[PDB]
mmCIF file of all heavy atoms in Angstrom:
data_model
loop_
_atom_site.group_PDB
_atom_site.id
_atom_site.type_symbol
_atom_site.label_atom_id
_atom_site.label_comp_id
_atom_site.label_asym_id
_atom_site.label_seq_id
_atom_site.Cartn_x
_atom_site.Cartn_y
_atom_site.Cartn_z
ATOM 1 N N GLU A 1 20.586 -28.807 -4.255
ATOM 2 C CA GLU A 1 19.162 -28.801 -3.950
ATOM 3 C C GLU A 1 18.909 -29.615 -2.679
ATOM 4 O O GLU A 1 19.695 -30.496 -2.340
ATOM 5 C CB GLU A 1 18.344 -29.368 -5.127
ATOM 6 C CG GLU A 1 18.806 -28.904 -6.515
ATOM 7 C CD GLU A 1 17.773 -29.241 -7.590
ATOM 8 O OE1 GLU A 1 17.542 -30.436 -7.867
ATOM 9 O OE2 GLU A 1 17.174 -28.308 -8.159
ATOM 10 N N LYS A 2 17.799 -29.366 -1.990
ATOM 11 C CA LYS A 2 17.255 -30.201 -0.916
ATOM 12 C C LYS A 2 15.964 -30.816 -1.432
ATOM 13 O O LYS A 2 15.263 -30.189 -2.214
ATOM 14 C CB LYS A 2 17.055 -29.362 0.356
ATOM 15 C CG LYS A 2 16.838 -30.212 1.616
ATOM 16 C CD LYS A 2 16.661 -29.332 2.866
ATOM 17 C CE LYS A 2 16.838 -30.189 4.124
ATOM 18 N NZ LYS A 2 16.546 -29.445 5.378
ATOM 19 N N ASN A 3 15.666 -32.049 -1.056
ATOM 20 C CA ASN A 3 14.440 -32.749 -1.451
ATOM 21 C C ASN A 3 13.518 -33.021 -0.256
ATOM 22 O O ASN A 3 13.940 -33.672 0.695
ATOM 23 C CB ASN A 3 14.777 -34.070 -2.164
ATOM 24 C CG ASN A 3 15.727 -33.911 -3.329
ATOM 25 O OD1 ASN A 3 15.323 -33.776 -4.471
ATOM 26 N ND2 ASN A 3 17.011 -33.923 -3.068
ATOM 27 N N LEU A 4 12.259 -32.581 -0.347
ATOM 28 C CA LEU A 4 11.100 -32.952 0.485
ATOM 29 C C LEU A 4 9.818 -32.521 -0.270
ATOM 30 O O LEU A 4 9.911 -31.829 -1.278
ATOM 31 C CB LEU A 4 11.180 -32.299 1.885
ATOM 32 C CG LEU A 4 11.876 -33.077 3.021
ATOM 33 C CD1 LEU A 4 11.798 -32.259 4.310
ATOM 34 C CD2 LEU A 4 11.242 -34.444 3.283
ATOM 35 N N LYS A 5 8.616 -32.952 0.153
ATOM 36 C CA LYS A 5 7.342 -32.773 -0.608
ATOM 37 C C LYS A 5 7.394 -33.309 -2.055
ATOM 38 O O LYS A 5 6.728 -32.835 -2.969
ATOM 39 C CB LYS A 5 6.812 -31.327 -0.501
ATOM 40 C CG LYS A 5 6.561 -30.857 0.939
ATOM 41 C CD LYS A 5 5.613 -31.765 1.740
ATOM 42 C CE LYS A 5 5.298 -31.189 3.128
ATOM 43 N NZ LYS A 5 4.494 -32.137 3.938
ATOM 44 N N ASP A 6 8.209 -34.348 -2.200
ATOM 45 C CA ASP A 6 8.529 -35.151 -3.374
ATOM 46 C C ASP A 6 9.141 -34.345 -4.525
ATOM 47 O O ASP A 6 8.937 -34.645 -5.696
ATOM 48 C CB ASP A 6 7.311 -35.991 -3.776
ATOM 49 C CG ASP A 6 6.570 -36.689 -2.626
ATOM 50 O OD1 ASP A 6 7.166 -36.956 -1.567
ATOM 51 O OD2 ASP A 6 5.386 -37.016 -2.789
ATOM 52 N N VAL A 7 9.822 -33.248 -4.225
ATOM 53 C CA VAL A 7 10.526 -32.492 -5.254
ATOM 54 C C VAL A 7 11.779 -31.887 -4.680
ATOM 55 O O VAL A 7 11.981 -31.790 -3.469
ATOM 56 C CB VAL A 7 9.706 -31.384 -5.952
ATOM 57 C CG1 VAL A 7 9.957 -31.466 -7.466
ATOM 58 C CG2 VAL A 7 8.197 -31.402 -5.702
ATOM 59 N N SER A 8 12.710 -31.590 -5.592
ATOM 60 C CA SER A 8 13.970 -30.923 -5.298
ATOM 61 C C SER A 8 13.812 -29.397 -5.312
ATOM 62 O O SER A 8 13.059 -28.830 -6.099
ATOM 63 C CB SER A 8 15.069 -31.376 -6.261
ATOM 64 O OG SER A 8 14.990 -30.761 -7.523
ATOM 65 N N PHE A 9 14.572 -28.740 -4.444
ATOM 66 C CA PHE A 9 14.561 -27.309 -4.185
ATOM 67 C C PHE A 9 15.987 -26.847 -4.081
ATOM 68 O O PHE A 9 16.657 -27.095 -3.081
ATOM 69 C CB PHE A 9 13.803 -26.990 -2.916
ATOM 70 C CG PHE A 9 12.357 -27.320 -3.107
ATOM 71 C CD1 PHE A 9 11.859 -28.602 -2.836
ATOM 72 C CD2 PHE A 9 11.561 -26.410 -3.811
ATOM 73 C CE1 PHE A 9 10.533 -28.907 -3.128
ATOM 74 C CE2 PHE A 9 10.251 -26.745 -4.166
ATOM 75 C CZ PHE A 9 9.730 -27.987 -3.798
ATOM 76 N N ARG A 10 16.458 -26.218 -5.141
ATOM 77 C CA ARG A 10 17.695 -25.453 -5.193
ATOM 78 C C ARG A 10 17.973 -24.738 -3.882
ATOM 79 O O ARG A 10 17.137 -23.990 -3.412
ATOM 80 C CB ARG A 10 17.544 -24.447 -6.324
ATOM 81 C CG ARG A 10 18.545 -23.286 -6.322
ATOM 82 C CD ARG A 10 19.966 -23.730 -6.616
ATOM 83 N NE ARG A 10 20.039 -24.274 -7.969
ATOM 84 C CZ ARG A 10 20.418 -23.634 -9.049
ATOM 85 N NH1 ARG A 10 20.992 -22.488 -9.012
ATOM 86 N NH2 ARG A 10 20.238 -24.148 -10.211
ATOM 87 N N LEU A 11 19.169 -24.931 -3.341
ATOM 88 C CA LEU A 11 19.725 -24.199 -2.210
ATOM 89 C C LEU A 11 20.809 -23.196 -2.641
ATOM 90 O O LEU A 11 20.986 -22.187 -1.959
ATOM 91 C CB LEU A 11 20.274 -25.180 -1.159
ATOM 92 C CG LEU A 11 19.402 -25.472 0.070
ATOM 93 C CD1 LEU A 11 18.108 -26.143 -0.355
ATOM 94 C CD2 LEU A 11 20.155 -26.402 1.006
ATOM 95 N N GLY A 12 21.524 -23.419 -3.734
ATOM 96 C CA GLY A 12 22.541 -22.471 -4.196
ATOM 97 C C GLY A 12 23.267 -22.948 -5.452
ATOM 98 O O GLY A 12 23.050 -24.063 -5.934
ATOM 99 N N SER A 13 24.149 -22.099 -5.977
ATOM 100 C CA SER A 13 24.916 -22.311 -7.209
ATOM 101 C C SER A 13 26.312 -21.715 -7.204
ATOM 102 O O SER A 13 26.523 -20.645 -6.631
ATOM 103 C CB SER A 13 24.202 -21.756 -8.432
ATOM 104 O OG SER A 13 23.220 -20.892 -8.097
ATOM 105 N N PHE A 14 27.233 -22.355 -7.925
ATOM 106 C CA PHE A 14 28.609 -21.911 -8.076
ATOM 107 C C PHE A 14 29.089 -21.945 -9.515
ATOM 108 O O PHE A 14 28.982 -22.918 -10.240
ATOM 109 C CB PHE A 14 29.618 -22.704 -7.231
ATOM 110 C CG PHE A 14 29.146 -23.164 -5.876
ATOM 111 C CD1 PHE A 14 29.195 -24.532 -5.563
ATOM 112 C CD2 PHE A 14 28.547 -22.265 -4.991
ATOM 113 C CE1 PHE A 14 28.591 -25.004 -4.397
ATOM 114 C CE2 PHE A 14 27.927 -22.737 -3.825
ATOM 115 C CZ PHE A 14 27.946 -24.109 -3.535
ATOM 116 N N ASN A 15 29.789 -20.884 -9.849
ATOM 117 C CA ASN A 15 30.791 -20.855 -10.893
ATOM 118 C C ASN A 15 32.037 -21.604 -10.402
ATOM 119 O O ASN A 15 32.812 -21.054 -9.617
ATOM 120 C CB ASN A 15 31.089 -19.379 -11.223
ATOM 121 C CG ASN A 15 30.901 -18.457 -10.041
ATOM 122 O OD1 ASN A 15 29.911 -17.786 -9.909
ATOM 123 N ND2 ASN A 15 31.784 -18.486 -9.092
ATOM 124 N N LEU A 16 32.247 -22.840 -10.848
ATOM 125 C CA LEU A 16 33.576 -23.441 -10.785
ATOM 126 C C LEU A 16 34.376 -23.047 -12.023
ATOM 127 O O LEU A 16 33.854 -22.596 -13.036
ATOM 128 C CB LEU A 16 33.515 -24.966 -10.556
ATOM 129 C CG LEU A 16 32.625 -25.446 -9.387
ATOM 130 C CD1 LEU A 16 32.970 -26.884 -9.010
ATOM 131 C CD2 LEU A 16 32.846 -24.654 -8.103
ATOM 132 N N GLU A 17 35.673 -23.223 -11.929
ATOM 133 C CA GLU A 17 36.625 -23.157 -13.016
ATOM 134 C C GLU A 17 37.318 -24.520 -12.967
ATOM 135 O O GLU A 17 37.638 -25.015 -11.880
ATOM 136 C CB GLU A 17 37.578 -21.947 -12.868
ATOM 137 C CG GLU A 17 37.083 -20.759 -12.014
ATOM 138 C CD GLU A 17 37.450 -20.849 -10.525
ATOM 139 O OE1 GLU A 17 38.509 -21.408 -10.170
ATOM 140 O OE2 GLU A 17 36.739 -20.223 -9.723
ATOM 141 N N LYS A 18 37.531 -25.175 -14.107
ATOM 142 C CA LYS A 18 38.404 -26.340 -14.137
ATOM 143 C C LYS A 18 39.798 -25.927 -13.703
ATOM 144 O O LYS A 18 40.316 -24.889 -14.102
ATOM 145 C CB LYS A 18 38.403 -26.993 -15.519
ATOM 146 C CG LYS A 18 39.152 -28.319 -15.422
ATOM 147 C CD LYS A 18 38.962 -29.196 -16.652
ATOM 148 C CE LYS A 18 39.767 -30.480 -16.449
ATOM 149 N NZ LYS A 18 39.656 -31.388 -17.608
ATOM 150 N N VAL A 19 40.390 -26.752 -12.873
ATOM 151 C CA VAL A 19 41.686 -26.505 -12.305
ATOM 152 C C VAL A 19 42.768 -27.119 -13.187
ATOM 153 O O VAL A 19 42.649 -28.214 -13.723
ATOM 154 C CB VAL A 19 41.644 -26.990 -10.850
ATOM 155 C CG1 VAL A 19 42.838 -27.822 -10.437
ATOM 156 C CG2 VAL A 19 41.410 -25.831 -9.902
ATOM 157 N N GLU A 20 43.821 -26.344 -13.367
ATOM 158 C CA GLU A 20 44.917 -26.567 -14.313
ATOM 159 C C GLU A 20 45.927 -27.602 -13.805
ATOM 160 O O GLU A 20 46.594 -28.255 -14.608
ATOM 161 C CB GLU A 20 45.621 -25.230 -14.627
ATOM 162 C CG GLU A 20 46.165 -24.482 -13.397
ATOM 163 C CD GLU A 20 45.047 -23.811 -12.611
ATOM 164 O OE1 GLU A 20 44.429 -22.915 -13.068
ATOM 165 O OE2 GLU A 20 44.698 -24.291 -11.563
ATOM 166 N N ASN A 21 46.039 -27.762 -12.494
ATOM 167 C CA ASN A 21 46.994 -28.649 -11.843
ATOM 168 C C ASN A 21 46.246 -29.750 -11.060
ATOM 169 O O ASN A 21 46.240 -29.761 -9.834
ATOM 170 C CB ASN A 21 47.950 -27.820 -10.977
ATOM 171 C CG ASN A 21 47.289 -27.123 -9.798
ATOM 172 O OD1 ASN A 21 46.181 -26.618 -9.871
ATOM 173 N ND2 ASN A 21 47.967 -27.055 -8.681
ATOM 174 N N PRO A 22 45.561 -30.672 -11.749
ATOM 175 C CA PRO A 22 44.640 -31.599 -11.105
ATOM 176 C C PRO A 22 45.294 -32.509 -10.072
ATOM 177 O O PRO A 22 44.933 -32.448 -8.898
ATOM 178 C CB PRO A 22 43.981 -32.360 -12.261
ATOM 179 C CG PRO A 22 44.917 -32.177 -13.450
ATOM 180 C CD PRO A 22 45.496 -30.802 -13.192
ATOM 181 N N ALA A 23 46.288 -33.302 -10.486
ATOM 182 C CA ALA A 23 46.980 -34.286 -9.639
ATOM 183 C C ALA A 23 47.607 -33.645 -8.371
ATOM 184 O O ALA A 23 47.796 -34.286 -7.340
ATOM 185 C CB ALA A 23 47.994 -35.036 -10.511
ATOM 186 N N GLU A 24 47.909 -32.346 -8.400
ATOM 187 C CA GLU A 24 48.570 -31.627 -7.308
ATOM 188 C C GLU A 24 47.659 -31.226 -6.156
ATOM 189 O O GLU A 24 48.037 -31.323 -4.988
ATOM 190 C CB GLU A 24 49.113 -30.315 -7.862
ATOM 191 C CG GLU A 24 50.434 -30.506 -8.597
ATOM 192 C CD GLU A 24 50.814 -29.245 -9.383
ATOM 193 O OE1 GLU A 24 50.637 -28.122 -8.869
ATOM 194 O OE2 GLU A 24 51.253 -29.354 -10.540
ATOM 195 N N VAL A 25 46.473 -30.712 -6.449
ATOM 196 C CA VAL A 25 45.547 -30.421 -5.353
ATOM 197 C C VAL A 25 44.992 -31.714 -4.786
ATOM 198 O O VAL A 25 44.767 -31.793 -3.584
ATOM 199 C CB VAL A 25 44.419 -29.484 -5.779
ATOM 200 C CG1 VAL A 25 44.911 -28.044 -5.656
ATOM 201 C CG2 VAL A 25 43.808 -29.748 -7.159
ATOM 202 N N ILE A 26 44.866 -32.751 -5.623
ATOM 203 C CA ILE A 26 44.604 -34.134 -5.208
ATOM 204 C C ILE A 26 45.683 -34.628 -4.232
ATOM 205 O O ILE A 26 45.325 -35.137 -3.171
ATOM 206 C CB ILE A 26 44.466 -35.026 -6.467
ATOM 207 C CG1 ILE A 26 43.107 -34.752 -7.155
ATOM 208 C CG2 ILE A 26 44.642 -36.520 -6.145
ATOM 209 C CD1 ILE A 26 42.964 -35.351 -8.557
ATOM 210 N N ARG A 27 46.982 -34.438 -4.531
ATOM 211 C CA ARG A 27 48.088 -34.753 -3.606
ATOM 212 C C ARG A 27 47.923 -34.136 -2.236
ATOM 213 O O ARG A 27 48.026 -34.825 -1.229
ATOM 214 C CB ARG A 27 49.401 -34.198 -4.166
ATOM 215 C CG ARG A 27 50.139 -35.110 -5.131
ATOM 216 C CD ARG A 27 51.354 -34.371 -5.689
ATOM 217 N NE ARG A 27 52.336 -35.295 -6.260
ATOM 218 C CZ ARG A 27 52.585 -35.555 -7.525
ATOM 219 N NH1 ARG A 27 51.930 -34.997 -8.495
ATOM 220 N NH2 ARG A 27 53.539 -36.378 -7.829
ATOM 221 N N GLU A 28 47.698 -32.832 -2.233
ATOM 222 C CA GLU A 28 47.481 -32.087 -1.009
ATOM 223 C C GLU A 28 46.313 -32.718 -0.238
ATOM 224 O O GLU A 28 46.482 -33.154 0.906
ATOM 225 C CB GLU A 28 47.272 -30.606 -1.377
ATOM 226 C CG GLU A 28 47.267 -29.662 -0.169
ATOM 227 C CD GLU A 28 46.357 -30.125 0.981
ATOM 228 O OE1 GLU A 28 45.133 -30.243 0.770
ATOM 229 O OE2 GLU A 28 46.843 -30.348 2.107
ATOM 230 N N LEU A 29 45.155 -32.918 -0.887
ATOM 231 C CA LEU A 29 43.963 -33.499 -0.262
ATOM 232 C C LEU A 29 44.237 -34.869 0.378
ATOM 233 O O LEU A 29 43.919 -35.057 1.554
ATOM 234 C CB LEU A 29 42.814 -33.519 -1.296
ATOM 235 C CG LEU A 29 41.433 -33.930 -0.739
ATOM 236 C CD1 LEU A 29 40.314 -33.327 -1.590
ATOM 237 C CD2 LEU A 29 41.203 -35.444 -0.758
ATOM 238 N N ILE A 30 44.850 -35.825 -0.340
ATOM 239 C CA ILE A 30 45.163 -37.143 0.244
ATOM 240 C C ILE A 30 46.240 -37.074 1.325
ATOM 241 O O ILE A 30 46.150 -37.838 2.283
ATOM 242 C CB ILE A 30 45.466 -38.242 -0.801
ATOM 243 C CG1 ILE A 30 46.665 -37.953 -1.722
ATOM 244 C CG2 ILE A 30 44.165 -38.514 -1.562
ATOM 245 C CD1 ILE A 30 46.804 -38.912 -2.905
ATOM 246 N N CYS A 31 47.181 -36.125 1.280
ATOM 247 C CA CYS A 31 48.076 -35.890 2.416
ATOM 248 C C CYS A 31 47.284 -35.541 3.682
ATOM 249 O O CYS A 31 47.441 -36.207 4.705
ATOM 250 C CB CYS A 31 49.114 -34.797 2.098
ATOM 251 S SG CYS A 31 50.271 -35.336 0.813
ATOM 252 N N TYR A 32 46.376 -34.559 3.607
ATOM 253 C CA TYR A 32 45.577 -34.158 4.750
ATOM 254 C C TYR A 32 44.720 -35.306 5.280
ATOM 255 O O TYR A 32 44.557 -35.470 6.488
ATOM 256 C CB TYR A 32 44.739 -32.954 4.358
ATOM 257 C CG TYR A 32 43.659 -32.595 5.359
ATOM 258 C CD1 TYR A 32 43.871 -31.593 6.323
ATOM 259 C CD2 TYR A 32 42.408 -33.231 5.276
ATOM 260 C CE1 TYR A 32 42.821 -31.190 7.170
ATOM 261 C CE2 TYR A 32 41.374 -32.857 6.144
ATOM 262 C CZ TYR A 32 41.562 -31.822 7.073
ATOM 263 O OH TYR A 32 40.525 -31.444 7.858
ATOM 264 N N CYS A 33 44.183 -36.141 4.390
ATOM 265 C CA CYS A 33 43.405 -37.302 4.801
ATOM 266 C C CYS A 33 44.281 -38.348 5.528
ATOM 267 O O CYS A 33 43.911 -38.791 6.610
ATOM 268 C CB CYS A 33 42.654 -37.863 3.587
ATOM 269 S SG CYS A 33 41.571 -36.610 2.841
ATOM 270 N N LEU A 34 45.449 -38.702 4.988
ATOM 271 C CA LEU A 34 46.374 -39.634 5.641
ATOM 272 C C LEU A 34 46.824 -39.120 7.025
ATOM 273 O O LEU A 34 46.935 -39.908 7.964
ATOM 274 C CB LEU A 34 47.568 -39.902 4.704
ATOM 275 C CG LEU A 34 47.188 -40.658 3.415
ATOM 276 C CD1 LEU A 34 48.303 -40.548 2.369
ATOM 277 C CD2 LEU A 34 46.928 -42.134 3.671
ATOM 278 N N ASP A 35 46.996 -37.802 7.179
ATOM 279 C CA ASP A 35 47.260 -37.168 8.451
ATOM 280 C C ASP A 35 46.054 -37.359 9.378
ATOM 281 O O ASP A 35 46.161 -37.936 10.461
ATOM 282 C CB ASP A 35 47.640 -35.699 8.190
ATOM 283 C CG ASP A 35 48.904 -35.566 7.335
ATOM 284 O OD1 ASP A 35 49.678 -36.537 7.179
ATOM 285 O OD2 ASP A 35 49.122 -34.472 6.787
ATOM 286 N N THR A 36 44.869 -36.982 8.913
ATOM 287 C CA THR A 36 43.639 -37.081 9.694
ATOM 288 C C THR A 36 43.296 -38.528 10.103
ATOM 289 O O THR A 36 42.763 -38.713 11.198
ATOM 290 C CB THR A 36 42.490 -36.394 8.940
ATOM 291 O OG1 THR A 36 42.880 -35.107 8.515
ATOM 292 C CG2 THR A 36 41.256 -36.186 9.816
ATOM 293 N N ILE A 37 43.643 -39.568 9.318
ATOM 294 C CA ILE A 37 43.602 -40.967 9.791
ATOM 295 C C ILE A 37 44.532 -41.094 10.991
ATOM 296 O O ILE A 37 44.075 -41.419 12.091
ATOM 297 C CB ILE A 37 44.061 -42.033 8.754
ATOM 298 C CG1 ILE A 37 43.283 -42.077 7.432
ATOM 299 C CG2 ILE A 37 44.013 -43.434 9.406
ATOM 300 C CD1 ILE A 37 44.042 -42.894 6.378
ATOM 301 N N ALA A 38 45.824 -40.843 10.774
ATOM 302 C CA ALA A 38 46.879 -41.077 11.747
ATOM 303 C C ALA A 38 46.606 -40.334 13.056
ATOM 304 O O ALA A 38 46.887 -40.875 14.125
ATOM 305 C CB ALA A 38 48.220 -40.674 11.126
ATOM 306 N N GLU A 39 46.086 -39.105 13.013
ATOM 307 C CA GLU A 39 45.802 -38.287 14.201
ATOM 308 C C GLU A 39 44.700 -38.901 15.064
ATOM 309 O O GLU A 39 44.864 -39.109 16.267
ATOM 310 C CB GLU A 39 45.378 -36.877 13.765
ATOM 311 C CG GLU A 39 46.565 -36.046 13.261
ATOM 312 C CD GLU A 39 46.116 -34.733 12.602
ATOM 313 O OE1 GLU A 39 45.060 -34.175 12.983
ATOM 314 O OE2 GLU A 39 46.842 -34.233 11.711
ATOM 315 N N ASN A 40 43.566 -39.237 14.450
ATOM 316 C CA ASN A 40 42.445 -39.832 15.172
ATOM 317 C C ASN A 40 42.742 -41.279 15.593
ATOM 318 O O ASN A 40 42.268 -41.715 16.636
ATOM 319 C CB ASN A 40 41.172 -39.680 14.329
ATOM 320 C CG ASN A 40 40.789 -38.215 14.226
ATOM 321 O OD1 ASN A 40 40.331 -37.607 15.177
ATOM 322 N ND2 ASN A 40 40.977 -37.599 13.085
ATOM 323 N N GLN A 41 43.577 -41.994 14.839
ATOM 324 C CA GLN A 41 44.131 -43.294 15.211
ATOM 325 C C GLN A 41 45.020 -43.166 16.471
ATOM 326 O O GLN A 41 44.738 -43.819 17.475
ATOM 327 C CB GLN A 41 44.832 -43.859 13.954
ATOM 328 C CG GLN A 41 45.402 -45.280 14.015
ATOM 329 C CD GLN A 41 44.445 -46.291 14.631
ATOM 330 O OE1 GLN A 41 43.598 -46.865 13.964
ATOM 331 N NE2 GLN A 41 44.532 -46.534 15.912
ATOM 332 N N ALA A 42 45.973 -42.221 16.498
ATOM 333 C CA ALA A 42 46.771 -41.920 17.695
ATOM 334 C C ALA A 42 45.923 -41.568 18.939
ATOM 335 O O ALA A 42 46.155 -42.098 20.025
ATOM 336 C CB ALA A 42 47.752 -40.791 17.352
ATOM 337 N N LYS A 43 44.882 -40.732 18.778
ATOM 338 C CA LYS A 43 43.895 -40.444 19.837
ATOM 339 C C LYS A 43 43.164 -41.714 20.294
ATOM 340 O O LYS A 43 42.936 -41.889 21.489
ATOM 341 C CB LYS A 43 42.918 -39.360 19.346
ATOM 342 C CG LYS A 43 41.866 -38.992 20.403
ATOM 343 C CD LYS A 43 40.935 -37.840 19.981
ATOM 344 C CE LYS A 43 41.613 -36.470 19.866
ATOM 345 N NZ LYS A 43 41.960 -35.887 21.186
ATOM 346 N N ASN A 44 42.831 -42.613 19.375
ATOM 347 C CA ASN A 44 42.161 -43.867 19.713
ATOM 348 C C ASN A 44 43.012 -44.761 20.594
ATOM 349 O O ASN A 44 42.531 -45.243 21.615
ATOM 350 C CB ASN A 44 41.736 -44.619 18.444
ATOM 351 C CG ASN A 44 40.761 -45.703 18.814
ATOM 352 O OD1 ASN A 44 41.059 -46.887 18.813
ATOM 353 N ND2 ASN A 44 39.583 -45.303 19.207
ATOM 354 N N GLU A 45 44.273 -44.957 20.216
ATOM 355 C CA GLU A 45 45.171 -45.809 20.997
ATOM 356 C C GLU A 45 45.289 -45.308 22.427
ATOM 357 O O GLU A 45 45.112 -46.069 23.374
ATOM 358 C CB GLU A 45 46.571 -45.845 20.387
ATOM 359 C CG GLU A 45 46.626 -46.528 19.026
ATOM 360 C CD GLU A 45 47.403 -45.663 18.034
ATOM 361 O OE1 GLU A 45 48.445 -45.081 18.403
ATOM 362 O OE2 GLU A 45 46.997 -45.602 16.861
ATOM 363 N N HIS A 46 45.447 -43.995 22.575
ATOM 364 C CA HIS A 46 45.494 -43.381 23.873
ATOM 365 C C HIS A 46 44.210 -43.637 24.694
ATOM 366 O O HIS A 46 44.282 -44.133 25.817
ATOM 367 C CB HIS A 46 45.853 -41.904 23.668
ATOM 368 C CG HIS A 46 45.621 -41.186 24.947
ATOM 369 N ND1 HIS A 46 44.407 -40.653 25.287
ATOM 370 C CD2 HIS A 46 46.278 -41.585 26.067
ATOM 371 C CE1 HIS A 46 44.344 -40.782 26.596
ATOM 372 N NE2 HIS A 46 45.458 -41.325 27.085
ATOM 373 N N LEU A 47 43.036 -43.439 24.101
ATOM 374 C CA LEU A 47 41.774 -43.700 24.775
ATOM 375 C C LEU A 47 41.568 -45.180 25.165
ATOM 376 O O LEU A 47 40.945 -45.430 26.202
ATOM 377 C CB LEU A 47 40.644 -43.157 23.890
ATOM 378 C CG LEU A 47 40.585 -41.624 23.811
ATOM 379 C CD1 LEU A 47 39.627 -41.217 22.695
ATOM 380 C CD2 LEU A 47 40.069 -41.017 25.116
#
């Protein structure tokens, strides 16, 4: 939802499914984040 005029207004909805391999997609996600730290950190040192 989005909120203005002191009320919430639905923007959309999803059918999620609970995921069977929780810790594994979490692994993938934190790998990409640790990469994205290191990449922008490497760009910073250069700048």
